[PDB]
Each structure stands twice: as C-alpha cells, then as structure tokens.
C-alpha cells in the first residue's frame, strides 16, 4: 500500500543523488594529476622485527609519540612495544583470545581491544600498582568488535559485526550514541583529524560518513563490489580511502561525495586487509592478502612500492604520526617496521 | 654500550619474553575444538556429556586440557571470522541420526539430513580447515533404531541398494558423510554413534584427538 510507493520514492531520490554526484564530476583525478611528476620507486627497508607473538597478529596501533605501539594477537596477548629498541614495554593477557582490533589512546594512558566476545576492553597503562589492568568493559554490542578508536581518554568509537557503530563514554560505560544504518557487518572505522566526523566501512560495500556529535549519517559512499575491510582518512580530513575484498582501493571525498580514484592492478586477485596514508597523503599503503604490502601513488594511481617481508597475510599496518616509519603486522606473528634511505 | 635504565629495560623485556614463551608452550599443549553443527542436533547433550558472542568451555580429562569454542550464537557473517579458527585441533560436527526423514521448518521442501550434508560440505572442504580433522558425532541413534524399522531409509536416499536394518543403514549414512571429504589425504573424519544413555563420548573425543595430536607431533618432528 505505502511500501511500494515509498520504495519507488527511494529509487527516485537515490537516482536524484546519483545525478547530483554526476553533475559535479567535471574531471577526474587522473587527468588532473597527469601533469605532476611521479614519486619514483619507493625503496623501503625493514629496520626492526618485533618477535614474541605466538599466533596471528590482527591489529596494531601506533602511539602518538611515534615510538610506542600496541599489537593484538590471538595467543591472548596485547603487547606494548618500544619500537626503537624492540623492547617489550608491557604484556597484557586478555580474557578472550579472539581479538580482532586494538587501539592506543592519544594520551598514551589507555589501550582498547575488542574481538569475538563483543566487549571492548579498556586497559589502564599508567597505574600506581605498576601493572596494567582493566579499567572498563564496554559491553552492549551483539556482534564482534571489528574496530575501535579513541577520541579522548573518555570517548571511544567502535564498529561491530551487528551493523552498528557506537560512541561510548568510558567512565560510565554506557553508549552515548548508537550509529545505525549499515546493512552488512561493519568492519572498520577511521576518525577524522579534528575528531568531529568518522567514516566507516561495512560488508555491504558501503562507507558511511557520520557526525559524532549529532549522531547522524552525513553521507553514504558506494562503488565497491564486496566487503570493505579497512578504511583510512586523508590527513587533512577532506577525503578518505577504502580497501575491499575485490582487490581494489578507492578514494572518496567528503565534499564532492564521490569516488575520485581507484587503485587496482590486474596482477592482484586477493583481498585488502589494511590501508593507511603517509604524512603528506601522497602514498597510500595498502596491505594486501597476497602476503605483500603495496604502496600506491595516491594522486596518480600507479604502484610505486612493494613491502614483501611477511610469510602470511599482511593483516594490519600503520604509519607513525610524524611519518617516519610504517609498521606492518601480519599473520606470521611478526611485526616489521619499515622506512627508506637516501 | 647502554645506560643503566636501558639495561634494566632490556632485562624487563627478557622477563616478558620468558613469560610469553612459557605461556605459549603451555597453550600449545592445549586441545582447541571448534564446535559446529545445526541447532539442537544434540549439541547441548554432548556439551553436558563432555562437561551473545563466543561460548568457550574449558575442561580437563586424563591430564589433557580441552577448550571448546561454540559460535552458534554469533549471528554475524561467518566469512569474516572463521579464519580465527584456522588452526584448531579438531572440529566437532554434530548430527542427529533421526533427522533423515524429518523436514526443516523454514522451507518445508529440503531434507534435514540433506541440510546436514550441505553443512558438512561447507565445513569439510573449507579453505581454512584443509588440515583440520573433523570429529563427526552421530547422535540419538536409539530413536533411529525405532525409526529405521517402520520408516524406510529410501526416502532420503534414492540410490540405496541396502537393507533396512540398523547397522547397514548406519554404515551407509557414515560412508555418505565421509565421502563428501574432497581432501582425504590431509584430514580424516572420526565418526561416533552415540545416545543419551552412553558414558563414553568424552572418551571418544579424547582418543580421536590423541590420534590427531600424535599425527601432528609426527608431522612436526619429520616422521611425516
């Protein structure tokens, strides 16, 4: 009665936003950046190798001081590493071994980890007793925790497998916002530089840009053919990039509302597990599933480097906040720090 | 070389490595069983026999420590978290034997045991369990012996040229389950015919997984 006319209205106004995106495409990124010079072969080298995990490494997060990191593996361990000296600063035994994400607070006081137990645990790194213990257990998702990021020492945005993102306050433990609107399992989120928006990617090939304070889906981005596994903001916050299982990265814009550039090579068949941007945004580092970690010229979409040092799937990666190095963790239980030489 | 605090930090990191390695060996002597099947096929019966995210059950038997992971409550997409169980010791796939003629409720046109063969085909030749042996439980056969005498097996099986007795029907069901195994060189299926009144199912999973453990230790020494 009303559902048929309502879905015809739905098709009508989403063709309206399709033609509105089509009205803005004056030119694409390729013939705009066809005049600028390429970056050359990005020759990077392994510097450290962080050994000590005894299962697959699922997530790493760089500290904001660009020296510490946290890594999560399914041997039940969250390891705080000093990346300069390869020292293990802390070893955190988790209650649930099935961890799929880890986060480092931007103050350095806390780490969050979440997995198949649907709980996002917050750990106090700097306590008076000397050890690390559980500050908070954010329970309230009904699917697996697939990502988590901190905004403060108090406000944390999570993605779950029950199609919802959430925004939690830690000192109460309750959700202050529930971001709903995805139809598939949400796999990744990426906070903006000013922490007022965040993009998210799910298994229905959708990247939803949310406003954190109003709690509403600002924009929705399509273009991929399968599950989007990782997402990352451009460093000025006016664009972002997704990596999906159809062997393709894409770069959408928050203002122009559409995809500008696609990162795909015919030699790659496998999925993409991680994407991250360099400090200038010129290089997009996508950790693929053919055991390599490719490095793309993010303005011209030609492949400029390969980081091939792992014996398994490059599962997580991350660039430091000062952009010195790139840590890739993989399913062969080995984190590797990378950068080039003059 | 290093400062005094750097050297005490390196000593702390060595203590971290020592506790990591001894915990990792204590965990490598663990039996991690992924529990799979359909809804109420005897899963609660076998989990009380062996004593909304994941449900892990830890127990011990004959000084061997078992952890068993039930992922039935996880209504998420299975193609995004099943590789977390790539590397379990065995998969306990549970199937009731009395569901060869009964029909599912959602479709009312497919057979229940045909749905069990579809699920066993999805679990057995999966790409993350090519090396994982599949313990196969076949449950409540004491009601199957009453259902096989009145109702024939030929409803489910067209190409059944066998008798309607108990042991021939059970052997035919077991061979039709074990013949979906498309990689029969790397894994092997261990089959058990159990009831509600038997005491020897945890003994079966102990013996079967002792076989899996000894074959794994043979493959890591070099004797395989």
């Amino acid at each position, epitope marked *: 009665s009303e559902l048929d006319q309502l879905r015809q209205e739905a098709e009508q106004l989403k063709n309206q936003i399709r033609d509105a995106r089509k009205a803005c495409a004056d030119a694409t990124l390729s013939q705009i950046t066809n005049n600028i010079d390429p970056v050359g072969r990005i020759q990077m080298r392994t510097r450290r190798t962080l050994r000590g995990h005894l299962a697959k490494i699922y997530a790493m997060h760089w500290g904001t001081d660009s*020296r510490l990191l946290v890594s999560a593996s399914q041997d039940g361990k969250l390891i705080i590493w000093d990346s300069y000296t390869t020292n293990k600063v802390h070893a955190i035994p988790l209650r649930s071994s099935w961890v799929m994400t880890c986060a480092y607070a931007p103050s350095g006081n806390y780490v969050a980890c979440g997995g198949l137990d649907n709980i996002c645990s917050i750990y106090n790194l700097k306590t*008076r007793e000397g050890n690390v213990r559980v500050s908070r257990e954010l329970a309230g998702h009904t699917g697996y925790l697939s990502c988590c990021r901190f905004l403060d020492d108090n406000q944390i945005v999570t993605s779950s497998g029950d199609t919802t993102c959430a925004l939690w306050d830690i000192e109460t433990g309750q959700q202050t916002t529930t971001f709903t609107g995805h139809t598939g399992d949400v796999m990744s989120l990426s906070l903006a530089p000013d922490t007022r928006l965040f993009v998210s990617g799910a298994c229905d090939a959708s990247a939803k840009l949310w406003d954190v304070r109003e709690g509403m889906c600002r924009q929705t981005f399509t273009g991929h053919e399968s599950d989007i596994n990782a997402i990352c903001f451009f460093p000025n916050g006016n664009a972002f990039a997704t990596g999906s299982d159809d062997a393709t990265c894409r770069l959408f814009d928050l203002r122009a509302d559409q995809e500008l550039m696609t990162y795909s090579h015919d030699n790659i068949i496998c999925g993409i597990t991680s994407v991250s941007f360099s400090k200038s945004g010129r290089l997009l580092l996508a950790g693929y599933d053919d055991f390599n970690c490719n490095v793309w010229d993010a303005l011209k979409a030609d492949r400029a480097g390969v980081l091939a040092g792992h014996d398994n799937r490059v599962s997580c990666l991350g660039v430091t906040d000062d952009g010195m190095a790139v840590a890739t963790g993989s399913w062969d239980s080995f984190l590797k720090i990378w950068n080039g030489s003059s | 070389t290093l*400062s005094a*605090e750097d050297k005490a*930090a390196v*000593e702390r990191s060595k203590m971290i490595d020592r506790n990591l390695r001894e915990d990792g060996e204590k965990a490598a002597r663990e039996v991690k069983l992924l529990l799979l099947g359909a809804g109420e096929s005897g899963k609660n019966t076998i989990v009380k026999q062996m004593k909304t995210g994941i449900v892990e059950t830890h127990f011990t038997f004959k000084d061997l420590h078992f952890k068993m992971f039930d992922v039935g409550a996880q209504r998420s997409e299975r193609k995004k978290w099943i590789h977390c169980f790539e590397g379990v010791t065995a998969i306990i796939f549970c199937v009731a034997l009395s569901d060869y003629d009964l029909v599912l409720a959602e479709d009312e046109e497919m057979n229940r045991m045909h749905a069990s063969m579809k699920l066993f085909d999805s679990i057995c030749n999966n790409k993350w369990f090519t090396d994982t042996s599949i313990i196969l439980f076949l449950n409540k056969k004491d009601l199957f012996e009453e259902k096989i005498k009145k109702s024939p097996l030929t409803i489910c099986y067209p190409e059944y040229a066998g008798s309607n007795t108990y042991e021939e029907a059970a052997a035919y069901i077991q061979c039709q389950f074990e013949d979906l195994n498309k990689r029969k060189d790397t894994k092997e299926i261990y089959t058990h015919f159990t009831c509600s009144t038997d005491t020897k199912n945890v003994q079966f999973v102990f013996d079967a997984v002792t076989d899996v453990i000894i074959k794994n230790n043979l493959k890591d020494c070099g004797l395989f």
Partner: single-chain antibody
Amino acid sequence: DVQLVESGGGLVQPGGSRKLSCSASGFAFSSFGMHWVRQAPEKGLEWVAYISSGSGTIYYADTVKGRFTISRDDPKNTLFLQMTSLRSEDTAMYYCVRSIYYYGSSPFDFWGQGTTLTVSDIVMTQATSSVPVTPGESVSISCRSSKSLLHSNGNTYLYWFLQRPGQSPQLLIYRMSNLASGVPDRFSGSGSGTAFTLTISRLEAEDVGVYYCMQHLEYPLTFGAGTKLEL
C-alpha cells in the same frame, strides 16, 4: 595504597650481623626492581644496594660490596638486606625504594618509611647548602655533576628528590624535566650538560626541607649533599 614497612634495625655490637626486612603491600612487587638507600644522621643520602626484577642483577656500593647481601622474596612480598661486619659507620636510616624501568617510567617513585640502625664515581656538586626564603617567592636550587648526563643515548638522568622533616624522600623530577605523580606543577626542572636546576615558583609552607639531586647514568648511584629550604 602502596606501602613499604621496614624492620630489624636497632642496637647491635660492632662487626656483627643484622637482617633488614622490607614488607611490601599494594603494588606488583615482582615487577619492580628494589633499592636500599641509607642516610646517616644529619647527613645526606647514599645509595646502598639494588636488586632487579626476578633477581637477575644485583649491584652494590663499594663501601658495602662484600659485606651486604640484598635478596628479594617475591611469594612473601619481602625485601631483605643481610648485613655482615657492621662497622660504626653504618649507623643510619635505611629506605626501601621501588623502581621500575621501561620507556617513560618513573623510577625511585615510592620510598619506604625506613628503619634506623644504630651501631657503636660521579660526584654531584650541590654546593649551596641552604637557601632562606618566605612563602610566595620562586627559588632555584642548582646542581652540577662530574661528567655530563646527556648524550645521544637520549635522556639526562638527573632525579630531584625532596625530604620534608620527619619524612621519607619523595620523587619530584625524573630525567631532569618530567614531573612525578602526586606533586604539583609549580616544581619545574631544567638544565643542560652538567648544570641543572629545580625551580619552585609560588612556594607554599610545605616545601620546607632538604632537596637532593641524584644521577642514574651509571652505577653507583650518587646523590648531592642536600640543599635546605627553611623559614
């Protein structure tokens, strides 16, 4: 709360032996290296001994190397100093000191209440032994070292401590700049090379006491002679 209580001290004959116990409570005692630091009556502090986490490193002062034995009991949460050949110089007050070492750590952070025993290198230049002041004005306590504590190893291992009268010492600054936990932001630490300073602006009445600069660049650990703040 964190707590370290010491026992065993008292009157002994010279040349004898005595057991000093430091019972720990309220912190991960196995994760912390421990020190003994003593203070002779109306004198400064001198580091005595150091046992590491898991007893994998035991350092002594050459005054007591061979005569003292430091040993921790982690299941009982106790620290022990066995004292052999006690001369009349060893009349002091002993402090059992937690210290943990990783990146960004705060060593020497909680000192025990100490016990009194009565029986009958890099040098820190802390020459100004008394600075008289009234509350409300900024004071600058200076300290100099024999060699530099800063190079390409990265840090500058100078530790400012404060001892209020009738109390244990308390960490103010570690690694020359970083303020400790539980101390206000008016305390500042600065310096370069061999010359360092502690600034106490907006000074209140509870900053009366003796202030010590310590080095942690290499063993043995040496303090300053003290700098008294009074009135």
